[PDB]
């Protein structure tokens, strides 16, 4: 019975905020383990006698980032014997997201793709000349396509991406794109 792992408030956060990792098993367990990759020893472990265990990371630092896994254990189990591991949880702690690239896709109407390297982000298109953004879209993919209408296409554009909700982590703006 594989447990599942969750991160609150987010999977991508700035250094200094508090992250609560939450592991849950189908039936109550005695000991929950928080593992980094390949290490037999859990970094953190909680004795709870519950189906749920919360791991509180106060003021996260870029060291607390990485791939996490949850496993549980019962008292009557062998030594170094743990349950099925949960699906991975990649926690990213950074001041800033890596800069996106803004390109035009060939096909009249014009389509742009703001591309970063991080999944689950909100992408935002800015028009050089206008303050408020032109278009914005939330995507699971590390890119988003914007469609520009025919004769409103020519101009100077740039994009940035950010986390969907607070605490926000922002990327820098892409190099401007000339149409």
């Amino acid at each position: 019975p594989k447990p599942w792992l969750g991160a609150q408030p987010a999977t991508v956060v700035t250094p200094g905020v508090n992250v609560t990792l939450r592991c849950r098993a189908p039936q109550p367990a005695w000991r929950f383990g928080l593992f980094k990759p390949g290490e037999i020893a859990p970094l953190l472990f909680r004795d709870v006698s519950s189906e749920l265990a919360e791991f509180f990371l106060e003021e996260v630092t870029p060291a607390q980032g990485g791939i996490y896994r949850c496993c549980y254990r019962r008292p009557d189990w062998g030594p170094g014997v743990w349950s099925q591991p949960s699906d991975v949880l990649e926690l990213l702690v950074t001041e800033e997201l890596p800069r996106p690239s803004l390109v035009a896709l060939p096909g009249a109407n014009v389509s742009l793709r703001c591309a970063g390297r991080l999944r689950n982000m909100s992408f935002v298109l800015y028009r050089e000349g206008v303050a408020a953004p032109l278009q914005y879209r939330h995507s699971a993919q590390p890119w988003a396509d914007f469609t520009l209408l025919g004769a409103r296409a020519p101009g100077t554009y740039s994009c940035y991406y950010h986390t969907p909700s607070a605490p926000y982590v922002l990327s820098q703006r892409s190099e401007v794109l000339v149409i």
Binding site: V124, H162, A166, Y168, L170, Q172, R173
Partner: peptide, 22 residues
Amino acid sequence: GPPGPPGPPGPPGPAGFPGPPG
């Protein structure tokens, strides 16, 4: 029922590019 309270504020815009050189 009645509608929910308004959502959280949006994210800030991207930081400004550095200025021209001297």
